[PDB]
Design a binder for this molecule. Sequence first.
Ligand SMILES: N[C@@H](CCC(=O)N[C@@H](CS)C(=O)NCC(=O)O)C(=O)O
Lengths: 209, 195
Amino acid sequence: AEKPKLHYFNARGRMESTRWLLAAAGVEFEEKFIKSAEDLDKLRNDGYLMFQQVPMVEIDGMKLVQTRAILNYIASKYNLYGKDMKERALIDMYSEGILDLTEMIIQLVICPPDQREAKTALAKDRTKNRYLPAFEKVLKSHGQDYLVGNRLTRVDIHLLELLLYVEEFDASLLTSFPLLKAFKSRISSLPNVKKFLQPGSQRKPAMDA
Amino acid sequence: AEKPKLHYFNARGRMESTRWLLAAAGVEFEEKFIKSAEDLDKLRNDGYLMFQQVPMVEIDGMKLVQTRAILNYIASKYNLYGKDMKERALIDMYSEGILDLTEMITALAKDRTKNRYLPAFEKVLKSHGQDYLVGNRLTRVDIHLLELLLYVEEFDASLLTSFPLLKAFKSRISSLPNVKKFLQPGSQRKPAMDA
Ligand SMILES: N[C@@H](CCC(=O)N[C@@H](CS)C(=O)NCC(=O)O)C(=O)O
């Protein structure tokens, strides 16, 4: 149809979850990366970032900014936002937890090394004692293939993405969570997901800058 | 009909934008205040806090945590989430900006208020001239904006000076029946909670 246009840096950052979500829906997208501060300025001065911030995604004729507005729109567009408002309630709740933990991990490489260590022991604690139990349970509470409504939703993709970053951050943390482990392989082998895990894709590595 | 039951500290904090949204929808709600560290532990152990955190709202026989999930649900149940995906994208975009500025409230946020966020929302109101931000109908984000404008006034009523459309907007939404009721003394609306 039309190709969405991701305006971000050449990094994971706040844009990766949208790349993932677009990828899982089988939606090809292009990116204009931002390397020069003038690019960001040329975007600001041209009236493209409502709050003068990236991420920003051109899609169906909008200059959508703010991560969550992007993710919600894409998810509704390609029926990754569930069946009804009660399922979106489960989806939003799950996604927001996933976001909290992700934010905690990606920010460890940013904080003062003053506190790297204890904030690291925090993320690991939260990973193993709060968030992973919470989603291991959800899979065990209903014993189904997906998080919500027994069919693929945006939050399955979010969780897989998080499971990938947990493994990077510390692969040991996953071993006491069997369903998530089964869930990870299940979702990883969905066609559009497998395609995105493949080398050469728009998927982004952990940056060092 | 069971009232939504809001589980939070007796404070503004992360629960206030929900109190606002319920009140602007004219929905009566009840509050169970976490008073003791023992109160929160027995919410966790009863299995009511999926991520061991509040805000938690009991609504329609389920226990919702995560503010955005709570707000999204309420806004959808009561037709404050706009009319289609494209209005939700405006509503989400506006709300998430409003949520960021609210978050910031040295005192750096005066600049962002005056030079980034408030110009953005005056321009929204300039663009279509209509009474509400989105779809020429009251939506949740009108209520979030009014809420932001109230806290900006508390922060520094001089930041509202240059923004005549926001000003009329504030007064205009303040005077909605359901809104006026929540602004009245004696409502569940919360103060800035000091210490
Ligand atoms: N993203 C969550 C954050 C919730 C949150 O930070 N809750 C605090 C209360 S204001 C809490 O229960 N903290 C206890 C803890 O984190 O251990 C939301 O928006 O609801």
